[PDB]
Amino acid sequence: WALEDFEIGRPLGKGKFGNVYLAREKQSKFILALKVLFKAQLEKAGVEHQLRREVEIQSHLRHPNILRLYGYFHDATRVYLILEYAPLGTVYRELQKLSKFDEQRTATYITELANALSYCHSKRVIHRDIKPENLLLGSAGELKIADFGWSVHAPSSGTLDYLPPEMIEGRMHDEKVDLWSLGVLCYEFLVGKPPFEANTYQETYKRISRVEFTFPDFVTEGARDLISRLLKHNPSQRPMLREVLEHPWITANSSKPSN
Ligand SMILES: Nc1ncnc2c1ncn2[C@@H]1O[C@H](COP(=O)(O)OP(=O)(O)CP(=O)(O)O)[C@@H](O)[C@H]1O
Numbered sequence: 001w002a003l004e005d006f007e008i009g010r011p012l013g014k015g016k017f018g019n020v021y022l023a024r025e026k027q028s029k030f031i032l033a034l035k036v037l038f039k040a041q042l043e044k045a046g047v048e049h050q051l052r053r054e055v056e057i058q059s060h061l062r063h064p065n066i067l068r069l070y071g072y073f074h075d076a077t078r079v080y081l082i083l084e085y086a087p088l089g090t091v092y093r094e095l096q097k098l099s100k101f102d103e104q105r106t107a108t109y110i111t112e113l114a115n116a117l118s119y120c121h122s123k124r125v126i127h128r129d130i131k132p133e134n135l136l137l138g139s140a141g142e143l144k145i146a147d148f149g150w151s152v153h154a155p156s157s158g159t160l161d162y163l164p165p166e167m168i169e170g171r172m173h174d175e176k177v178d179l180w181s182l183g184v185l186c187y188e189f190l191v192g193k194p195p196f197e198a199n200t201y202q203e204t205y206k207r208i209s210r211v212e213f214t215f216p217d218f219v220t221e222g223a224r225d226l227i228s229r230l231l232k233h234n235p236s237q238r239p240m241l242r243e244v245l246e247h248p249w250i251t252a253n254s255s256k257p258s259n
């Protein structure tokens with residue numbers, strides 16, 4: 001597997017370690033996304049081994065709400081990831097355009113997230129880096145979790161906007177990290193801002209460890225209940241994904257069934 005087997009198109013995104021390009025395999029005309037990481041940069045930090053673990057985790061995951069990793073190769077200087085192509089962009093860009101989502105879209109997206117996370121937790125997998133810019137949209141507008149560069153196994157040990165207290169406090173985290181991020185996202189979808197945003201890293205840190213946030217008036221009581229249950233300082237207090245998928249506000253507003 002070499003780069004000569006793909007025609008490269010426009011870039012789909014740019015990052016510190018590399019770039020993502022639309023691409024087509026020449027033999028079959030299969031269109032896909034090619035993520036080109038540069039070893040030099042991955043080595044400048046201690047990330048090349050986290051990349052190896054992320055690739056091994058993602059290749060064993062098959063779920064309609066998880067971006068597929070078809071394969072991977074490398075050359076002298078670059079690492080190539082062969083990714084499923086998500087043609088409708090990121091939830092982040094959708095959030096900028098629409099400013100905020102209504103209860104129906106939010107509940108649908110949370111349901112799709114909770115389904116995919118349930119499949120991951122049912123295989124001892126945490127993501128930790130669930131940001132809007134890592135949620136992609138498929139041809140039918142379905143959510144796909146991408147960017148598994150931070151996923152890990154077991155407890156284990158940028159902007160903090162989506163990280164729970166136990167992570168910023170440097171403690172040992174577990175599968176409950178994904179529950180906190182789910183509550184951050186639910187809030188951001190309805191309000192248009194993550195609930196602990198601030199002009200400063202140091203201030204954002206304080207807010208998260210205190211769980212200091214407030215709702216705009218238009219947030220309904222059902223959304224407040226779900227969000228307050230997820231954003232608990234104590235991981236063991238956060239609900240299970242089953243409790244989320246069966247939350248009243250989710251069932252009433254979600255257009256997609258649960259799992
Ligand atoms: N299969 C895919 N289909 C469509 N767009 C994609 C895509 N994969 C990535 N992108 C776009 O490129 C951006 C960055 O890709 P990705 O999040 O996977 O790498 P990354 O976050 O690790 C960047 P860095 O190397 O700096 O850490 C995404 O936010 C998205 O806009």
Ligand SMILES: [Mg+2]
Nearest residue numbers: 133134146147
């Ligand atoms: Mg990303």
